[PDB]
């Protein structure tokens, strides 16, 4: 079908190769996943040596990591806002790796309350001791906390959904957030 070989291309000198061999199976290629959003639907692919591979079609939630905070929560995905390879993936809401998405951000604000006791945006003694002891770490950044006021965080997909089935990511932070923010707010 889709072949993954180099014998069908021209040489570096530019000559046309002759057909040495029929298409072998160990050099095959398969159609893309084009993972949409909503109503999770994972198919299986049997691959070389047994060794199952999970095509996610139409994934709904994901596990997203806050790297400066060292946690990760299972959060719902709102939609893709940027893709460095293609704008039609942003339009059609496809989820690949390196896609800039919006996520729900409510588990992160629940963890931030339960861990630090200050609310983002705008009772027991043990919790008071814990929240006082980890003080001067409850001042995260301006950009992320303004997103927390708006209830949608910017994340980047670090997983490959067509291969593992999962759509994992990390929250955008720092200079990478500023770069993609200039990309997004660019007219």
């Amino acid at each position: 079908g889709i072949s993954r070989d180099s014998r069908h291309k021209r040489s570096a000198t530019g000559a046309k190769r002759a057909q040495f061999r029929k298409k072998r199976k160990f050099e095959l290629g398969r159609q893309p996943a084009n993972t949409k959003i909503g109503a999770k639907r994972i198919h299986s692919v049997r691959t070389r040596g047994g060794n199952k591979k999970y095509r996610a079609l139409r994934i709904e939630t994901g596990n997203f990591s806050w790297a400066s905070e060292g946690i990760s929560k299972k959060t719902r995905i709102a939609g893709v806002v940027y893709h460095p390879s293609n704008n039609e993936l942003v339009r059609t809401n496809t989820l690949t790796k390196a896609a800039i998405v919006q996520i729900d951000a409510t588990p992160f604000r629940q963890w931030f309350e339960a861990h630090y006791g200050q609310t983002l945006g705008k009772k027991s003694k043990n919790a008071e001791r814990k929240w006082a002891a980890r003080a001067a770490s409850a001042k995260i950044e301006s950009s992320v906390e303004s997103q927390f006021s708006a209830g949608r965080l910017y994340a980047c997909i670090s997983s490959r959904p067509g291969q593992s089935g999962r759509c994992d990511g990390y929250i955008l932070e720092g200079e990478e957030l500023a770069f993609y923010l200039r990309r997004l707010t660019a007219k």
Partner: protein, 142 residues
């Protein structure tokens, strides 16, 4: 060397995370390694800001296999040069030799600056591109 951030994606080294909470000197974590085989890692790799995924020093490639030497005859690609290896081929009937040559496309890191006429030594890596399998490890002529 006028911007780093030219592409549509954010150029960064993978799994090298700079914590936004802390504030120190030594502005960013930069990963670098020594490529081995007695090749010295250049200071422009250690102190620079370029990203260059296919670099033998800061990037994710490893040098193993042949070490070759050629002369640069083309620099017109981006981060890629063509070297020319000249050799003599012996013909046993006439009991003498003839001049032959091959052209090798090699990857060049932004730590190195080559022009046409420089002699370079290159190290074999995994396939970089359709034709490139070698990577510049030391430029030591002009």
């Amino acid at each position: 060397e006028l911007t780093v951030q030219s592409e549509r994606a954010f150029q960064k080294q993978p799994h090298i995370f700079n914590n936004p909470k802390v504030k120190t000197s030594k502005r960013t974590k930069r990963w670098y390694k020594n490529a081995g085989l007695g090749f010295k890692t250049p200071k422009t790799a250690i102190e620079g800001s370029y990203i260059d995924k296919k670099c033998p020093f800061t990037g994710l490639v490893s040098i193993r296999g042949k070490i070759l030497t050629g002369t640069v005859v083309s620099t017109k690609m981006h981060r890629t040069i063509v070297i020319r290896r000249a050799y003599l081929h012996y013909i046993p009937k006439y009991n003498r030799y003839e001049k032959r040559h091959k052209n090798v496309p090699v990857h060049v890191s932004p730590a190195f600056r080559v022009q046409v006429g420089d002699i370079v030594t290159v190290g074999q890596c995994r396939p970089i591109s359709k034709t490139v399998r070698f990577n510049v490890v030391k430029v030591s002529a002009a």
